């Protein structure tokens, strides 16, 4: 349990070592599973299920991003549970959308994924998957279980 408003952490398998060097331009590599707080703890996304782990890069260590707040409180090999209130979870459907597109093998830089993705959202009022659409329309909290695997410094 660290502290920002509307976020409750619960470490559940501690990491091997002191807090790592989370500096601007570090690639953080990890696994995550995100779940509703219904009875099922219904799973919405799970990197293990898709197979490959997720890599992000620290935009700026002083202007930290809401996921980077979670990632940056983690020692390597740590597995932690981050509950997050409705306030932080509004953007999740659009992240999830963006990641699911990543998986298939396509990036905003590439015109279409982006532009075609905008066409479809405007034309049809959809992110492209019902669960994210359901999730958008019923804002709520989410629990993200995360395993930190690796942290590299920039080239």
Swiss-Prot record:
Cellular location(s): Cytoplasm; Nucleus
Domain PPIase FKBP-type: 48-140
Lineage top rank: taxon: Eukaryota
Tissues expressed in: Highly expressed in retina. Specifically localized to the developing photoreceptor layer and within the photoreceptors of the adult retina.
Disorder association: Leber congenital amaurosis 4: A severe dystrophy of the retina, typically becoming evident in the first years of life. Visual function is usually poor and often accompanied by nystagmus, sluggish or near-absent pupillary responses, photophobia, high hyperopia and keratoconus.
Quaternary organization: Interacts with NUB1.
Role this protein plays: May be important in protein trafficking and/or protein folding and stabilization.
Name of the protein in question: Aryl-hydrocarbon-interacting protein-like 1
Residues of the full protein shown: 6 to 160 of 384
